Structure 1
Amino acid sequence: TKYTADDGTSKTALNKLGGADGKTEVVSIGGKTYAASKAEGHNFKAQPDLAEAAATTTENPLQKIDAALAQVDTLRSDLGAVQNRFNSAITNLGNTVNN
């Protein structure tokens, strides 16, 4: 698995077997483990914020999904409210310019 490594150069790493099944290919940089397809050709110089490979069957997945979903809907609500504030401001601006 090949990539543009930390320092800024292009480097290669050899594959290894891992995963929740334990039979998929993984490759490591700096001790962080990644799956080949995710890592392949990746510019690690620029997106260090990149997911790792799993170790186990993720117990309690639905809880995690639901918490994320709640955050999403909170943000959508806030955006809607802000849009409405903008509409009211536009109305007021029109009235004031006419006056």
Structure 2
Amino acid sequence: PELAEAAAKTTENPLQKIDAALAQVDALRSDLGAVQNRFNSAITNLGNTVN
């Protein structure tokens, strides 16, 4: 039960809205990409521990 609701009225600020979306998205991407560094360092840890 969720569909985008027709806009009540023209957006007061078309920028502010898209800067917030880019910040949420950019921030999410940055957060996601640190986990790849965590996994890479964990893999190089487990290699020497297995050896």
Q: Distance in 1 between matches of 2:49 and 2:6?
A: 58
- Structure that is richer in strand per residue: 1
Which residue in the other structure is 1:51 paired with?
Answer: 4
The answer to which structure has the higher helix fraction is 2
* SS of residue in 1 equivalent to 2:5: coil
Give the structure with higher Rg (CA). 1
Displacement of 1:55:
2.4
| Distance across 1 between alignment mates of 2:29 and 2:11 | 28
Kindly report structure 1 stretches of 4+ aligned residues shifted beyond 4 Å: none
What TM-score results when the alignment is normalised by the length of structure 1?
0.48
Higher relative contact order (CA 8 A, sep 6+): 1
Segments of 5+ residues of structure 2 without an aligned counterpart are none
2:41 aligned with 1:88, yes or no?
yes
- Mapped partners of 1:56, 1:67: distance in 2: 19
Deviations 1:2-52 (A, max 9, x none): xxxxxxxxxxxxxxxxxxxxxxxxxxxxxxxxxxxxxxxxxxxxxx12111
Identity of aligned pairs, percent? 94
Q: Secondary structure at the match of 2:2?
A: coil
Q: How many residues align?
A: 51
Instruction: State the Cα distance separating 1:87 from its structure 2 match.
Output: 0.2
> CA separation in 2, counterparts of 1:78 and 1:86?
13
- What is the RMSD of the two structures over their aligned residues, measured on CA atoms? 1.0
Helix, strand or coil: the match of 2:6?
coil
Give the aligned partner of residue 79 of structure 1.
32
Which blocks of at least 5 consecutive residues in structure 1 are unaligned?
1-47
Structure 2-normalised TM-score? Answer: 0.88
